[PDB]
Tab-separated table of C-alpha atoms and ligand atoms in Angstrom:
chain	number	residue	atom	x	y	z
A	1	UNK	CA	130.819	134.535	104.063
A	2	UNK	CA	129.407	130.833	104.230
A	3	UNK	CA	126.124	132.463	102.373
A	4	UNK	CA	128.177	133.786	99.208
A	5	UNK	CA	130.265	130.238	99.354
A	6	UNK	CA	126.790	128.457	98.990
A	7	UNK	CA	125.477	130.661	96.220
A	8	UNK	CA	128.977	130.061	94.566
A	9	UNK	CA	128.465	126.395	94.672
A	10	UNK	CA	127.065	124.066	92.498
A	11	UNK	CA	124.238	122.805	94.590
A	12	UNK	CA	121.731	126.030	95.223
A	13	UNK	CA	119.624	124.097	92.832
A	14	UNK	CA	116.951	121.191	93.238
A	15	UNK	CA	118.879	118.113	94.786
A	16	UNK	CA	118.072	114.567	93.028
A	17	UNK	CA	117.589	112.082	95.287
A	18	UNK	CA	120.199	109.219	94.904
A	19	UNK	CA	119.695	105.325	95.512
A	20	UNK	CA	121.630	102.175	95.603
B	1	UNK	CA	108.481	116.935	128.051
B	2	UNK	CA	108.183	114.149	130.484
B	3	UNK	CA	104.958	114.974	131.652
B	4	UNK	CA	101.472	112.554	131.012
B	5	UNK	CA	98.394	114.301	132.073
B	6	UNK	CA	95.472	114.248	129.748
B	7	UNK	CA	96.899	116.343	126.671
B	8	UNK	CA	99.149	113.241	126.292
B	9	UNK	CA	95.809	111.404	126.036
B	10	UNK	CA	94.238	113.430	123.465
B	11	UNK	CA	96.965	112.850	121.490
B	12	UNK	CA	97.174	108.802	121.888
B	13	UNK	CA	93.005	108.765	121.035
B	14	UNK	CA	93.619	110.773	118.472
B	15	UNK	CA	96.336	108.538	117.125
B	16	UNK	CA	94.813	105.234	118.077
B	17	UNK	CA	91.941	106.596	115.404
B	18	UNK	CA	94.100	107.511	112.752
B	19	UNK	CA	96.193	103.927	112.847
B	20	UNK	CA	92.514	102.725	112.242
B	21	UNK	CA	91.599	104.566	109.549
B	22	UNK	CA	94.881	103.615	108.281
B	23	UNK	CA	95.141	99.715	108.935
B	24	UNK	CA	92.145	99.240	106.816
B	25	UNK	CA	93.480	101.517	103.710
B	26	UNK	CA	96.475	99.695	104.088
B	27	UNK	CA	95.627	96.481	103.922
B	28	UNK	CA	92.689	96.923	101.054
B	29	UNK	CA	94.538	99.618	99.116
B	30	UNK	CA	92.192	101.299	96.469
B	31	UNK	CA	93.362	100.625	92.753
B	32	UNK	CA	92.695	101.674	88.944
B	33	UNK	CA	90.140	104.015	90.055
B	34	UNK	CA	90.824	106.665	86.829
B	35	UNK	CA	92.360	106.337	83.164
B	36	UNK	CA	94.402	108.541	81.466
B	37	UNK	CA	91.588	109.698	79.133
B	38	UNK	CA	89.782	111.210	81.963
B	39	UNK	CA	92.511	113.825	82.004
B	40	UNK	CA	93.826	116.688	79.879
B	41	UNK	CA	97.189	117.887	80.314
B	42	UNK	CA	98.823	121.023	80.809
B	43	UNK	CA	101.687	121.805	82.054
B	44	UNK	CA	104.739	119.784	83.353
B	45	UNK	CA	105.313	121.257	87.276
B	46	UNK	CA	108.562	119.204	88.290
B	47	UNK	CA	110.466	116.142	87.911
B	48	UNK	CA	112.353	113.281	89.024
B	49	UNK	CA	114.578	110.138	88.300
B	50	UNK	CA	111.404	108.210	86.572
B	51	UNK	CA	109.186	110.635	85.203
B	52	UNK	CA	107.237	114.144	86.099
B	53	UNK	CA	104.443	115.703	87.406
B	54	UNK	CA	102.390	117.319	85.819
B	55	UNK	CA	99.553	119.761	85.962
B	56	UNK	CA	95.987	118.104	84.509
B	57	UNK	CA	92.860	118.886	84.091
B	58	UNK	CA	89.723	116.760	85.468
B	59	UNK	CA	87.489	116.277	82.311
B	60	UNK	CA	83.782	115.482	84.218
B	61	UNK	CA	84.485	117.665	87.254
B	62	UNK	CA	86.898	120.109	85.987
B	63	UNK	CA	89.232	120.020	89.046
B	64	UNK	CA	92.742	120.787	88.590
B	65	UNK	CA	95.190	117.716	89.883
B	66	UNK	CA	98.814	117.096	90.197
B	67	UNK	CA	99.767	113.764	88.349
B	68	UNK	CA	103.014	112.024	88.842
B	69	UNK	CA	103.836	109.869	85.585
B	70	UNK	CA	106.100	106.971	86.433
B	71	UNK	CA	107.739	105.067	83.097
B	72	UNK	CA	107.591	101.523	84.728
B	73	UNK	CA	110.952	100.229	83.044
B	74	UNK	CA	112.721	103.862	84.154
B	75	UNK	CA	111.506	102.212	87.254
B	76	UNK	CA	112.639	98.879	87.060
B	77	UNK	CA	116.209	99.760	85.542
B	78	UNK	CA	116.495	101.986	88.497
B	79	UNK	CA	115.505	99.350	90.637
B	80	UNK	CA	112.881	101.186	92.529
B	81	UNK	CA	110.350	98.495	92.095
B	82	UNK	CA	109.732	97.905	95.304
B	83	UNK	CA	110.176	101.854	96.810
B	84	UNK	CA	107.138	102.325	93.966
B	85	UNK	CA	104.933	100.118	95.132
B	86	UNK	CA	105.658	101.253	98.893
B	87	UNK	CA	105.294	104.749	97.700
B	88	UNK	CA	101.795	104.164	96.311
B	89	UNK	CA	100.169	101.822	99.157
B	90	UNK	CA	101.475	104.298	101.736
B	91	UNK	CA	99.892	107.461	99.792
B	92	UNK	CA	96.710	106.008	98.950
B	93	UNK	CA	96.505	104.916	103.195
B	94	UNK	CA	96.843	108.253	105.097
B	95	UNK	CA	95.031	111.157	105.819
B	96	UNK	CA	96.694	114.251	107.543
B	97	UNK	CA	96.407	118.012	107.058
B	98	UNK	CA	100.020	118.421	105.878
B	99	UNK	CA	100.146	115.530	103.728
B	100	UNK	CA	99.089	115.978	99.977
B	101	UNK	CA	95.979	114.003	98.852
B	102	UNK	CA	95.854	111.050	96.396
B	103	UNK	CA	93.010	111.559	94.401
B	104	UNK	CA	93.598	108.598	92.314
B	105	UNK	CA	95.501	106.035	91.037
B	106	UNK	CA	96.095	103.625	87.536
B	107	UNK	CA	98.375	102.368	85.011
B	108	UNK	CA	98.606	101.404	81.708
B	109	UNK	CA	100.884	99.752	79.246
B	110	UNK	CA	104.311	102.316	79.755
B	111	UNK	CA	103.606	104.135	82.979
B	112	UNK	CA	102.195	103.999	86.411
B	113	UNK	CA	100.059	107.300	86.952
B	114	UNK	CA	98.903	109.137	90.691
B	115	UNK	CA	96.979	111.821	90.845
B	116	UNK	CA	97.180	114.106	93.660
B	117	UNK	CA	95.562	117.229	94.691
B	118	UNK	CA	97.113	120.593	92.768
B	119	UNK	CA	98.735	122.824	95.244
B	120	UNK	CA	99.635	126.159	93.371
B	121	UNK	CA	101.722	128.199	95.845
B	122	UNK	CA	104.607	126.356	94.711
B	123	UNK	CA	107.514	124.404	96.251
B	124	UNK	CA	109.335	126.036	99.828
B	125	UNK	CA	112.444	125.719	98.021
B	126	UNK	CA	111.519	128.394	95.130
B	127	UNK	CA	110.727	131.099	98.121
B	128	UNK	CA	113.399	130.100	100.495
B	129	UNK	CA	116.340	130.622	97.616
B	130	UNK	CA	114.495	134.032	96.106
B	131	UNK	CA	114.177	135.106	99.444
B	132	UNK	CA	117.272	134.202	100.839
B	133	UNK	CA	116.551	132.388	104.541
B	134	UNK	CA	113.203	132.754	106.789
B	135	UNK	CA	112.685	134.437	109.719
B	136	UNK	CA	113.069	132.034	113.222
B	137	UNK	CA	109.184	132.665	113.702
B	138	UNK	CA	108.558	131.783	109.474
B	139	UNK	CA	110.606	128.632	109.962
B	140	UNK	CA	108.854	127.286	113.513
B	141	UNK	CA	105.217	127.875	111.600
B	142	UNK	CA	106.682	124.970	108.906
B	143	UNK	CA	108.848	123.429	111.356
B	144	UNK	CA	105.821	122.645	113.390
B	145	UNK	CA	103.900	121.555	110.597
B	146	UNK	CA	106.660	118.829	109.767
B	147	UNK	CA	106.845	118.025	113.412
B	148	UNK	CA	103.000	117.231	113.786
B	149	UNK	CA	103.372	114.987	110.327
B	150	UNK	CA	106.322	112.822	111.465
B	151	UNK	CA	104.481	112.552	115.191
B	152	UNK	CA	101.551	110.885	112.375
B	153	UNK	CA	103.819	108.745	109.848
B	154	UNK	CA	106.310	107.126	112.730
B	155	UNK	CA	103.106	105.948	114.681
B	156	UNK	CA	101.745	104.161	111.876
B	157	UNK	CA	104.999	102.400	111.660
B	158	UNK	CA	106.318	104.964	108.737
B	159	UNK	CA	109.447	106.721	107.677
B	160	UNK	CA	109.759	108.845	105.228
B	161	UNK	CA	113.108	109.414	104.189
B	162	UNK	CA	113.215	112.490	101.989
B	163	UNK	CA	112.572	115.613	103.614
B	164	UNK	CA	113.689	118.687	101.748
B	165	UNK	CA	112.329	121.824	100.946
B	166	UNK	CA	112.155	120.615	97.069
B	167	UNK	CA	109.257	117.900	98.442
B	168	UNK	CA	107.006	120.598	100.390
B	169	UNK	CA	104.629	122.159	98.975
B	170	UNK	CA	103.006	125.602	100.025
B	171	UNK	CA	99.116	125.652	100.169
B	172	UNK	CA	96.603	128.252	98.966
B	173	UNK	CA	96.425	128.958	103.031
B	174	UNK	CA	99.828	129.599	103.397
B	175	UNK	CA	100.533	125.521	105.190
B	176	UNK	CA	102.551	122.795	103.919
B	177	UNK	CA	102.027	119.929	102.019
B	178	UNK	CA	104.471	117.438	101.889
B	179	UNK	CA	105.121	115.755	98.401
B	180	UNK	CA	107.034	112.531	97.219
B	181	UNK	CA	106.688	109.601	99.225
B	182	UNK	CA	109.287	107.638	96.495
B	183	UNK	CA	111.012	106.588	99.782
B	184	UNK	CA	108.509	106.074	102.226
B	185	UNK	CA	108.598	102.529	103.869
B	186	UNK	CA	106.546	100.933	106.332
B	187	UNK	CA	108.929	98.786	108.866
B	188	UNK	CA	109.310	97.458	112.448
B	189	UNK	CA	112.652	97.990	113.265
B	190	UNK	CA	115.838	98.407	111.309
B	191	UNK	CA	116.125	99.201	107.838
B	192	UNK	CA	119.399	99.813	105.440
B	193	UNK	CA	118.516	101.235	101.990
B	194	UNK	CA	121.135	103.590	101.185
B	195	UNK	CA	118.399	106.313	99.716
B	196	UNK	CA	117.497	110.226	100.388
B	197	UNK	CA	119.473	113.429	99.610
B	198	UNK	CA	123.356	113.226	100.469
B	199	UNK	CA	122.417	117.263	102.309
B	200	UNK	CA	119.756	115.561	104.304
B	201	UNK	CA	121.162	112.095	105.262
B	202	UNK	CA	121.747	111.214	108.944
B	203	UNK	CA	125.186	109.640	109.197
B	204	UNK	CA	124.107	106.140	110.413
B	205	UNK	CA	122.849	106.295	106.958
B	206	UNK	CA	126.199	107.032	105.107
B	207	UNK	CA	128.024	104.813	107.219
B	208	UNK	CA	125.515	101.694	106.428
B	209	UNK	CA	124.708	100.971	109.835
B	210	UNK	CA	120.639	100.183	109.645
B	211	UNK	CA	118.529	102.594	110.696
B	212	UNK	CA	115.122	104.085	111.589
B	213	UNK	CA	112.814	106.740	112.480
B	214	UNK	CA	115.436	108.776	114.163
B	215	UNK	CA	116.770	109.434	110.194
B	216	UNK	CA	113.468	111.586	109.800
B	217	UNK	CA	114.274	113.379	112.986
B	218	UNK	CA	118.272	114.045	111.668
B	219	UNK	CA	116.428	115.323	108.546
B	220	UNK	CA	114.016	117.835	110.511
B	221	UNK	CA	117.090	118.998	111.927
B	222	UNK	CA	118.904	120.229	108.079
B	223	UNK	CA	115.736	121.575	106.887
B	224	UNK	CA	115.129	124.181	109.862
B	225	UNK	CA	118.799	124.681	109.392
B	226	UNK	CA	118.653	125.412	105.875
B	227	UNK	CA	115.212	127.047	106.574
B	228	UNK	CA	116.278	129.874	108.913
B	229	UNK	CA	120.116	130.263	107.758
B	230	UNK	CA	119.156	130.211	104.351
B	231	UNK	CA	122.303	127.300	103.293
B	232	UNK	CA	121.811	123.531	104.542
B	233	UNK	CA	124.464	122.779	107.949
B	234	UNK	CA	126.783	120.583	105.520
B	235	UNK	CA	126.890	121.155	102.179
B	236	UNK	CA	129.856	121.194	99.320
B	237	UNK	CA	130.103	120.811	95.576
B	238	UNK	CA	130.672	116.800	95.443
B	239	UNK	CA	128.272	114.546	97.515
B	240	UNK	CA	131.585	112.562	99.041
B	241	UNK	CA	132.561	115.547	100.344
B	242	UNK	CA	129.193	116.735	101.710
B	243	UNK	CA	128.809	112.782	103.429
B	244	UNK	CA	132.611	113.563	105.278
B	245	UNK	CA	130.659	116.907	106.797
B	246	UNK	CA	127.973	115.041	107.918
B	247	UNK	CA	129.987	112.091	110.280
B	248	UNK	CA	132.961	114.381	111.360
B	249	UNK	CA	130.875	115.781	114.373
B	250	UNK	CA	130.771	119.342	113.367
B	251	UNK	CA	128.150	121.770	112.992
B	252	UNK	CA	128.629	125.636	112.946
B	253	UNK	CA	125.603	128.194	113.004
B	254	UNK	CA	125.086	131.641	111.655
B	255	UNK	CA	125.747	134.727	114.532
B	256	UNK	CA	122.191	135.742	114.279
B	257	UNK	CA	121.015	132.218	115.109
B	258	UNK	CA	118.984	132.294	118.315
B	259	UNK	CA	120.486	130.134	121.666
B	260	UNK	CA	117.378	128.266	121.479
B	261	UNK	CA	117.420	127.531	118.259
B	262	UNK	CA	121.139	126.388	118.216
B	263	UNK	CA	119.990	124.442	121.463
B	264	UNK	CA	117.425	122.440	119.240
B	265	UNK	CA	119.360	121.589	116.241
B	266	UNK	CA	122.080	120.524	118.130
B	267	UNK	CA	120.067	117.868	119.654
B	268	UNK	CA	118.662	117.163	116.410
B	269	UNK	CA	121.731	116.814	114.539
B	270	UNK	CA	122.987	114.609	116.724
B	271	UNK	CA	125.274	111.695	115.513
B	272	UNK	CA	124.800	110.059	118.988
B	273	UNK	CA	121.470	108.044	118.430
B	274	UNK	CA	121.395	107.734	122.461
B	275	UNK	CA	121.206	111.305	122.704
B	276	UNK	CA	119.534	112.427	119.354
B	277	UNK	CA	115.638	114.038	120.074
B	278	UNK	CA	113.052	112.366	118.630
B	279	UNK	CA	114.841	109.043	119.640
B	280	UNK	CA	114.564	109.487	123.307
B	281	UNK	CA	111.841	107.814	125.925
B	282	UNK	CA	110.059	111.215	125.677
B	283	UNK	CA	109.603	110.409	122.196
B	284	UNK	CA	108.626	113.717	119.775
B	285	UNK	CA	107.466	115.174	123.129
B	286	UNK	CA	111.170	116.384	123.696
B	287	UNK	CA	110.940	118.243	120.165
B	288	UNK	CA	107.211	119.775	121.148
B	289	UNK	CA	108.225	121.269	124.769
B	290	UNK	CA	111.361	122.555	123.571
B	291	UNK	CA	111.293	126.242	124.439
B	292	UNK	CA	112.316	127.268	120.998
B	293	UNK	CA	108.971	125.806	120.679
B	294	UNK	CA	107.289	127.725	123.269
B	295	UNK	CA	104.872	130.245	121.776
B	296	UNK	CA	103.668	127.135	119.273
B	297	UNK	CA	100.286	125.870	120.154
B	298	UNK	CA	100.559	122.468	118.196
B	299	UNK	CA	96.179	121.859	118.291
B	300	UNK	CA	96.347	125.665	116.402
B	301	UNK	CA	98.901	124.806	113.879
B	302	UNK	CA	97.023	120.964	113.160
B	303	UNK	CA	93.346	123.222	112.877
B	304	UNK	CA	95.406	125.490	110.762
B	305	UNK	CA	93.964	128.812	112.951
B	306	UNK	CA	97.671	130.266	112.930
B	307	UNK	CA	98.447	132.678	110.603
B	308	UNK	CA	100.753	132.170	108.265
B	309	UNK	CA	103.884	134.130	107.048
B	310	UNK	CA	102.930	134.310	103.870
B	311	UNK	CA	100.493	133.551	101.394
B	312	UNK	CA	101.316	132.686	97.949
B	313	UNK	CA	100.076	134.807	95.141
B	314	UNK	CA	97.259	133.109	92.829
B	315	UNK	CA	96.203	134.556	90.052
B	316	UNK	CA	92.610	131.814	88.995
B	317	UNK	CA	92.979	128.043	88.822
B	318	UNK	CA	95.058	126.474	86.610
B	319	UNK	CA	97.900	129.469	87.213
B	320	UNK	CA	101.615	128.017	87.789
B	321	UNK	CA	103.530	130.978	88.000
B	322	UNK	CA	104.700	129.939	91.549
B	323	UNK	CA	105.998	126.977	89.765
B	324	UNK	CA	109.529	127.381	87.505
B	325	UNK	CA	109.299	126.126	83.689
B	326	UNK	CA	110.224	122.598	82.136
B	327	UNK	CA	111.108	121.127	79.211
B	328	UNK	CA	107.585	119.378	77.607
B	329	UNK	CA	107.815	115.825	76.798
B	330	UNK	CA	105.183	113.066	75.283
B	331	UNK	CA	103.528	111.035	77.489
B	332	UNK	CA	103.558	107.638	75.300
B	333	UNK	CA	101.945	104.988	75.697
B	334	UNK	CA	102.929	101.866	74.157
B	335	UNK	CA	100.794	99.213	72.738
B	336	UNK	CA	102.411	96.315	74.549
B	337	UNK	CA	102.184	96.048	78.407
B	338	UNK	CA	105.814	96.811	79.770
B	339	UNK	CA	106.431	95.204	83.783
B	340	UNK	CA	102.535	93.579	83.865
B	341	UNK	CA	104.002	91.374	86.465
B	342	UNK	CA	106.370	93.635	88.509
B	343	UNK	CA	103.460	96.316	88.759
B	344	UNK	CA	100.520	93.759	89.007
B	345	UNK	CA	99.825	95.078	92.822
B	346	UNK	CA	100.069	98.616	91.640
C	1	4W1	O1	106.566	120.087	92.907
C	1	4W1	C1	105.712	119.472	91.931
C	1	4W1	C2	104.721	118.528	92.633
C	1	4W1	C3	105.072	117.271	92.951
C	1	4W1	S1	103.744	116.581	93.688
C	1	4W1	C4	102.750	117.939	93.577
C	1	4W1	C5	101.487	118.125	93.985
C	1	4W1	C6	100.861	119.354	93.779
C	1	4W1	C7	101.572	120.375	93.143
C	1	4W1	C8	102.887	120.118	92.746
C	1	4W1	C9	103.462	118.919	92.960
């Protein structure tokens, strides 16, 4: 399922912004 | 969605007000109106790239606060000079339920300090992972919320650049606050700072095109996405990867997605800026009469008479357990002035 490929991945936690 | 009777009106007057209010904030922007001393510290709640907020203490009053500590040569090595000073002017100007208050502002030798009103029920993004995904009728209550606050920022010239559900805040009434204006930018016309979060950005970002409001609307478009399916529309393990989601074209939604619903985020995740709502004559109009907007009433959400999903648990002020733990850190303070001139308008 997409759900269990999301909790598999490495970005379920807090996302850093990004710049430049 | 077309339509300009007198509710249309309302909403100008009410507007026309606000930009007041706003102009005059804006232009005179209030400055060093605390020191650090007036504060004891707690707890750290979150951070960033530059520094962290943290939970304080108001010494005279006793008021819990929210203060974001910036480390002005983080700041400057990051080359966010600029994007801090924006960040500041623009906080310190507006006044809207949904946006969180600055209380105050200062600096000192190291760091550049705000101060903003504590909001204990924690950030959307802790519930929405524990819980999984919101209901369609949980996510329209915040939805709306967000809706209401771009209509405010984009007619005061605004964008804000960074919607996620890391930056919104949930209130003691069950509403949103929306945190972190790092990015916010006042502009006529185009801009072309590569800046956000790669899950969030529109692709006329990615593909360094120049850009405006629409980029908020894109934006609103992932987070009731990720809101109601409970994953963002493109996401991966590598950002490059997530960026080659976002301009293919492609977006797939869950079976239990309603037709309205998928109706509505297609036009919001719309690559085609022609077509994209939010960007068309009807303006945010196209987003309010939507009919997966239809039982909203947007004056009830703004007076904040709707009730709300949920309301986060509080146990006394001064409690963070909505809040996850951090790692503690000294706030120091050197005794030579670091970026007096850089920071001079801050
Ligand atoms: O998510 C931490 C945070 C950043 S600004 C702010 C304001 C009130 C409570 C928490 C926060």
């Amino acid at each position: 399922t997409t759900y269990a490929d999301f909790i598999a991945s490495g970005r379920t936690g807090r996302r850093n912004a990004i710049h430049d | 969605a077309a339509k300009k009777g007198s509710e249309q009106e309302s909403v100008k007057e009410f507007l026309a007000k606000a930009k007041e209010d706003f102009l005059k904030k804006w232009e005179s922007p209030a400055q060093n109106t605390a020191h650090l001393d007036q504060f004891e510290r707690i707890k750290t709640l979150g951070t960033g790239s530059f520094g962290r907020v943290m939970l304080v203490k108001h010494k005279e009053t006793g008021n819990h606060y929210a203060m974001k500590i910036l480390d002005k040569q983080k700041v400057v090595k990051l080359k966010q000079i600029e994007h801090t000073l924006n960040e500041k002017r623009i906080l310190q100007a507006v006044n809207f339920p949904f946006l969180v208050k600055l209380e105050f502002s200062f600096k000192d030798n190291s760091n550049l300090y705000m101060v903003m009103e504590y909001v204990p029920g924690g950030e959307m993004f802790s519930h929405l992972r524990r819980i999984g995904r919101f209901s369609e009728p949980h996510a329209r209550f915040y939805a709306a919320q967000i809706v209401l606050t771009f209509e405010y920022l984009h007619s005061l010239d605004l964008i804000y650049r960074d919607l996620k559900p890391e930056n919104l805040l949930i209130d003691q009434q069950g509403y949103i606050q929306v945190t972190d204006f790092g990015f916010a930018k006042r502009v006529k016309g185009r801009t072309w700072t590569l800046c956000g979060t790669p899950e969030y950005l529109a692709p006329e970002i990615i593909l360094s095109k120049g850009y405006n409001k629409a980029v908020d609307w894109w934006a609103l478009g992932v987070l009731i996405y990720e809101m109601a399916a409970g994953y963002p529309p493109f996401f991966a393990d590598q950002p490059i990867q997530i960026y080659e989601k976002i301009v293919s074209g492609k977006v797939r939604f869950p079976s239990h997605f309603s037709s309205d619903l998928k109706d509505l985020l297609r036009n919001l995740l719309q690559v085609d800026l022609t077509k994209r709502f939010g960007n068309l004559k009807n303006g945010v109009n196209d987003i309010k009469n939507h009919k997966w907007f239809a039982t909203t009433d947007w004056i009830a959400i703004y007076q904040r008479k709707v009730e709300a999903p949920f309301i986060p648990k509080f146990k006394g002020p001064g409690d963070t357990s909505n809040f996850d733990d951090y790692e503690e850190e000294e706030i120091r303070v050197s005794i030579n002035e670091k970026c007096g001139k850089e920071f001079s308008e801050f």
